[PDB]
Amino acid sequence: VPLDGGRFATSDLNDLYRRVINRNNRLKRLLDLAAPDIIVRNEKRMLQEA
Amino acid sequence: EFDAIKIALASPDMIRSWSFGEVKKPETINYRTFKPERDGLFCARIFGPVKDYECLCGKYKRLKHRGVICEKCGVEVTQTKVRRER
Amino acid sequence: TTDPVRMYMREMGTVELLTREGEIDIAKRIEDGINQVQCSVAEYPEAITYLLEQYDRVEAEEARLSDLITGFVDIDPELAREKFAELRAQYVVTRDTIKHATAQEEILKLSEVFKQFRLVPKQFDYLVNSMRVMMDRVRTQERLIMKLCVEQCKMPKKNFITLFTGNETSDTWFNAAIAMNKPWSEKLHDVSEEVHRALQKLQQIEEETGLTIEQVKDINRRMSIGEAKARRAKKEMVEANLRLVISIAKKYTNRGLQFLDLIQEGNIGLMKAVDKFEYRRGYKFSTYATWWIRQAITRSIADQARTIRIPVHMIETINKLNRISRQMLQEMGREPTPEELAERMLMPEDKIRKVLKIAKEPISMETPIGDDEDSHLGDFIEDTTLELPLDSATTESLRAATHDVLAGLTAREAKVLRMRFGIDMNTDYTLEEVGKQFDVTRERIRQIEAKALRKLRHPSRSEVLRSFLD
Amino acid sequence: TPEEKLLRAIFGEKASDVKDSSLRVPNGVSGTVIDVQVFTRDGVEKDKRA
Ligand SMILES: CCC[C@@H](C)[C@H]1CC[C@H]2[C@@H]3[C@H](O)C[C@@H]4C[C@H](O)CC[C@]4(C)[C@H]3C[C@H](O)[C@]12C
Ligand SMILES: CCC[C@@H](C)[C@H]1CC[C@H]2[C@@H]3[C@H](O)C[C@@H]4C[C@H](O)CC[C@]4(C)[C@H]3C[C@H](O)[C@]12C
Ligand SMILES: [Zn+2]
C-alpha cells in the first residue's frame, strides 16, 4: 500500500516470496551453464532454506 | 452452502488447478508509474484488474465489456475484488 | 551444523590453491580441448554451406560484414572478401568433383583452408547445436529400430553387430535377414513397416551427410572427449577462484542481499572469466577474474536488492549523488541542500529533486508501532476503495426516484430516455440505434429526447430529483 | 453511473475536477485560534498570508 509522503508499506510475505523466485530463477539459469556440481548443490540448499 | 470442511494434502495438479498463472519475475510494481509488472508478484494478467471494470492499458473502461480479456494487455475487465481471491 | 554457509565453507576448503604453473597448465588443457572440438567440427561439410549462405545473405545487406565473422586467423574488408571468394571457389571445385578417391583430398584441402577462418561464439554454438540435433535424430532413429527389433523379437546383439555394422545404409541387413530362418526374423514381419520407414529416413539423412556414419560416430566421440576435457579443466580452475570469490563477496556483505546470494552471483562471474581468460596476455588470473566477479556482484545488487526495482542507471545516479553529498557534508559543514547539490553535480536541479524523491525501502507492516496490546503498523491502514453505506443507500434511492419519474411520463418517451442512457439496461445506445427500434429517421429521436428533458425540467414534476442533485 | 447522467442532463450541472480535502476542526471541539504558522518549500510562491 502507498502511505502519505510517497512512502510504501509492505508485508513480509512479499519479501520472502521474492527470495524464492530469485533463487529459483538462478537455479534454472545455473543448470543451463552445466556449472560444477558444488555450485548447483549450494544453490539447491539455499533454495530449500528460502 | 456447506455442511463440512475437509482437509488434505495438495497434489501438484491441484495446486496448478487453483492458480491463474505462473509468477516468473520477482518484480512487484513500477517505480515511476506504480503499475503492476508483467509477471511479478503483483500482476494484473494473473491476479485480476486493479480498478473496477477497466483494463490496465485503459482501452476498455465500462461494464459494457464485462468479462472480456483485453487483446493488448490480457487483463480481464472485472471487479477489482477478484484480486483478493486469485 | 545448520548454517548453509558453514557447509559451503567446509565443502570449499578441501581444495588447494593453484600456483602459477598450475593455472598455466589448466589453461593449456582448456585450449587443447577446444582445439580438439574445433578440428572435430571442421570435418563437417554441411556447416561450410550454411556459412556461405549467411555470407551471401549479408552480401545482400541483411547484416554487417564484421558481425557475421569474428575475423580470421591472420582486418580489412577486401582481404575477407578475397578469402571468401577463394573459399567459394575451393568449395565448388571440390563439390563438382565427387567422381571418390580424388574427392577426399579436395575435401581435405577445403577443410584446411577453412580452418584459417574464425567464427563468432554464438554462430559456432548454433552450428554445433545443429550438428548435435542431427546426431540426436539419427541416434533416436537407431534406438527405435533397436527397440523394435530386439525387445519385440529378442534379436541377438551379435546378429545386429554383424549385419547393421559394415554398410549401415542399404536395407539388406534387415530385409535379407528376414529370411534367416530364426524366430526373431519371422517376428520382424509385423514390425517391418516401422523398420522400413526408419531405414528410409536413415538413408535420406546419410545421403544428406555424404560420409560414412562410422566416421560420424568417431567425430562425435572425439568431440565428446574434447568437451569433457574442457569442462573438467574449467571445473578444476573454478575452485581456487571460489576461494577468491568469497573475499570479494565479503567486501559487499551488508547491502540488502544475503551473504550466500552474493557468493553465488560471484561464482557465476568467476565462471564467466575462466571461459574468457587467456595465458597469451600473461596476466595473472586473479587480476582478470576480480573485475568480472565485482561486476557480477554489483549488477546483482542493482537487480535483486530492492523490492520496487530501480534501473541500473538510476542506481548509479543515486550512488554518485550520495558520494557527492558525503563529500559536501565533510567539507562545507552542515549539509548540502538540493540547490547546492545540483551545483556541485551537473543537473537541472529538478532531476535532483526526483532522485531525492525516489522512495526508500518500504516500511514493514509488522513494525511494532503499537507499544500496547502488541499493535503493529498494519492495524492502522484503512481501505479506501470501499463505498460508504450511506452512498449505497443514496444510489438506491436515486434509482427509485428516476424509475418513478420515468414512469410518470408516457411510454415512447420513457423508453427513448431509458435507452438513451444505460438506465436499467447494461448496454448503451445512441440516436442511430434508437431510431432503428422506433422506426425513426434520427430526428423525430433527438427532438423526443429534448422534449422529455424539457418536461422533466418542469417544477413540481421533478423536485426529489433536484434534491438528489448537490 | 447510468442515472447520474440523467440528472446532470436534466439540470445541466457540471463536474468539479477538484476535491474538498481541507482541514476542519475535529467534531466536538470548540476553541479559538491563537496562532497560525506557515512553512513553505524553498521554491514556492509564498502567498500573502506567509
Ligand atoms: C518508533 C516507535 C514505533 C513507531 C512509532 C515508529 C517506528 C517507524 C515509524 C515509521 C517510520 O519510521 C517512517 C514512516 C514514514 C514517515 O517517515 C513517518 C511515518 C512512518 C510510518 C513512521 C510512523 C511511526 O512513527 C513508526 C511506525
Ligand atoms: C500510537 C498512535 C500513533 C499515531 C499517533 C500515529 C503515529 C504514525 C501514524 C501512522 C503513520 O503515519 C503511517 C500511516 C500514514 C497514512 O496516512 C495512514 C495512517 C498511518 C497508519 C498513520 C495513523 C496514526 O496517525 C499513526 C499510527
Ligand atoms: Zn489492455
Short mmCIF file of C-alpha atoms in Angstrom, two decimals, chain A residues 1-3 5-15 18-19 22-23 25-26 29-30 33-46 49, chain C residues 4 7-8 11 231 235 238-239 242 258 260-261 263-265 267-268 270-271 303-308 357 359-366 377 381-382:
data_model
loop_
_atom_site.label_atom_id
_atom_site.label_comp_id
_atom_site.label_asym_id
_atom_site.label_seq_id
_atom_site.Cartn_x
_atom_site.Cartn_y
_atom_site.Cartn_z
CA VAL A 1 0.00 0.00 0.00
CA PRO A 2 1.15 3.63 -0.51
CA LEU A 3 1.42 5.80 2.59
CA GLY A 5 4.68 11.19 1.62
CA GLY A 6 5.49 8.90 -1.29
CA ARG A 7 6.45 6.05 1.05
CA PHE A 8 5.13 2.49 0.85
CA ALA A 9 4.20 -0.13 3.44
CA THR A 10 4.56 -3.79 2.51
CA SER A 11 4.00 -7.21 4.03
CA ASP A 12 6.88 -9.52 4.91
CA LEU A 13 5.49 -12.24 2.64
CA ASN A 14 6.38 -10.25 -0.47
CA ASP A 15 9.99 -10.19 0.73
CA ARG A 18 10.86 -12.67 -3.82
CA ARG A 19 13.71 -14.65 -2.27
CA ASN A 22 15.25 -15.12 -7.25
CA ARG A 23 17.00 -18.27 -6.12
CA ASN A 25 15.50 -18.45 -11.31
CA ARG A 26 19.21 -18.67 -10.59
CA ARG A 29 19.99 -20.46 -15.05
CA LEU A 30 22.83 -22.38 -13.43
CA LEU A 33 25.64 -23.42 -17.78
CA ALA A 34 26.46 -27.01 -16.75
CA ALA A 35 28.13 -25.48 -13.72
CA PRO A 36 30.22 -27.63 -11.38
CA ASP A 37 28.02 -29.62 -9.03
CA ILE A 38 29.33 -27.81 -5.94
CA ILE A 39 27.68 -24.56 -7.01
CA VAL A 40 24.40 -26.19 -8.02
CA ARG A 41 24.24 -28.06 -4.71
CA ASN A 42 24.86 -24.84 -2.81
CA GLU A 43 22.08 -23.14 -4.78
CA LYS A 44 19.68 -26.02 -4.07
CA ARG A 45 20.46 -25.80 -0.35
CA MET A 46 19.80 -22.06 -0.46
CA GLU A 49 16.26 -22.63 3.04
CA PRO C 4 24.31 -23.36 4.78
CA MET C 7 28.57 -26.30 4.95
CA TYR C 8 29.68 -24.37 1.87
CA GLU C 11 32.95 -28.32 1.17
CA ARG C 231 34.65 -28.99 -18.80
CA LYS C 235 35.91 -27.25 -13.12
CA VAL C 238 36.90 -22.89 -10.65
CA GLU C 239 37.71 -23.91 -7.07
CA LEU C 242 35.91 -19.84 -5.46
CA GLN C 258 22.27 -12.05 1.76
CA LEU C 260 25.27 -16.51 0.19
CA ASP C 261 23.38 -14.80 -2.65
CA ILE C 263 28.68 -15.59 -3.18
CA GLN C 264 26.56 -17.38 -5.78
CA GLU C 265 26.45 -14.34 -8.06
CA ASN C 267 30.53 -17.70 -8.64
CA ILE C 268 28.73 -17.06 -11.96
CA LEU C 270 34.31 -16.43 -11.97
CA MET C 271 32.84 -18.98 -14.42
CA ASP C 303 18.71 -6.06 -9.61
CA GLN C 304 17.78 -8.16 -6.56
CA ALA C 305 18.28 -5.76 -3.65
CA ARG C 306 15.18 -3.56 -3.94
CA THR C 307 11.53 -4.59 -3.74
CA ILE C 308 10.50 -1.82 -6.15
CA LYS C 357 12.17 11.68 -4.05
CA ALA C 359 11.23 6.21 -2.28
CA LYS C 360 13.43 4.25 0.09
CA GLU C 361 12.66 0.68 1.12
CA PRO C 362 9.01 0.14 2.16
CA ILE C 363 8.17 0.05 5.86
CA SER C 364 7.20 -3.41 7.06
CA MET C 365 3.54 -3.65 8.05
CA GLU C 366 4.56 -5.62 11.15
CA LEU C 377 1.56 -0.73 11.69
CA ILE C 381 -4.12 1.30 7.47
CA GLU C 382 -7.66 1.67 6.16
#
